[PDB]
């Protein structure tokens, strides 16, 4: 099966996943001074405040807090999207180390981990329809730097202790995704794709230029996870980002100056 190790990396996913080497994959390096300003782009509409979190989960590769995404509750709109994006989970990718992590770089600076607020475009009416449409989702990107503590993130470092394995669920309800936001909403935008198998070129990326700060022991809390399951061989679940892929025949719109 496709992880992050030396024998089922980012390297090898090709092939189960021929799309790995696709002309719109992600994620990218953002080369700060080739990307154009585009005075076009609104700014992002982000409309969390009746957003109803529900679980928490270890899939293997990464930890997601998931939604009701059965009504219009916690939405994405505006920015350089049509219509309306509904949030169904949140995740991250982080390093070992603080100095790697983040999939995005940012003029090959890379953060220590990224946060994926992963959204689906309503007129596709599910999330496995959405994916399969290269307008089908919009995912907002958020870099993580190791610095003072994020209060809004304490609690899911608190609970990670109870989903340390692969397949391991917990009941994570009245989550705010508010608390994750940094104070600006400037991104750059860019058409994509899912950063795991598999692979799908259906994403919207929308990446903030503002990182959040964590501190050192939130993050060393993400670095006690397994990528195994309970009763198998330990694997600490780290390095778990795809890195920068060919940005090909694509420009990424800046929504500032
Ligand atoms: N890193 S990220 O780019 O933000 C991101 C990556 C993967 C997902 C994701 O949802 N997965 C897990 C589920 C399977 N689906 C596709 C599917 C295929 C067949 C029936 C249903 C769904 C896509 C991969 C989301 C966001
Ligand atoms: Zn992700």
């Known amino acids: ?74 939405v994405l ?16 990718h982080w390093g070992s180390l603080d100095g ?8 090959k600076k890379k953060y220590a981990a990224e946060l994926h607020l992963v959204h689906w475009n309503t007129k596709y009416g599910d999330f496995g329809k959405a994916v399969q449409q290269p307008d089908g989702l919009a995912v907002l990107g958020i870099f993580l730097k190791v610095g003072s503590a994020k209060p809004g993130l304490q609690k899911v470092v608190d609970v990670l202790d109870s989903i340390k394995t692969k397949g391991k669920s917990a009941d994570f309800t009245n989550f705010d995704p508010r608390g994750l936001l940094p104070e600006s909403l400037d991104y750059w935008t860019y058409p994509g794709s899912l950063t795991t198998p598999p ?32 009763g198998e061989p330990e694997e600490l679940m780290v390095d778990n980002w795809r890195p920068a892929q060919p940005l090909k025949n694509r420009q990424i719109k800046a929504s500032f100056k």
């Open 1 to 74: 099966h496709w992880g992050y190790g030396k024998h089922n990396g980012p390297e090898h996913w090709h092939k189960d996943f021929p799309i790995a080497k696709g002309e719109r994959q992600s994620p990218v390096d953002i080369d700060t001074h080739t990307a154009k300003y585009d005075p076009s782009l609104k700014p992002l509409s982000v409309s969390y405040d009746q957003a109803t979190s529900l679980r928490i989960l270890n899939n293997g590769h990464a930890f997601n807090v998931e939604f009701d995404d059965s009504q219009d509750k916690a």
């Open 77 to 92: 709109k505006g920015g350089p999207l049509d219509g309306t994006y509904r949030l169904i989970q949140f995740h991250f």
């Open 100 to 107: 790697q992590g983040s999939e995005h770089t940012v003029d």
């Open 199 to 230: 692979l799908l070129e259906c994403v919207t990326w929308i990446v903030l230029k503002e990182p959040i700060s964590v501190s050192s022991e939130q993050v060393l809390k993400f670095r006690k996870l397994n990528f195994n399951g309970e």
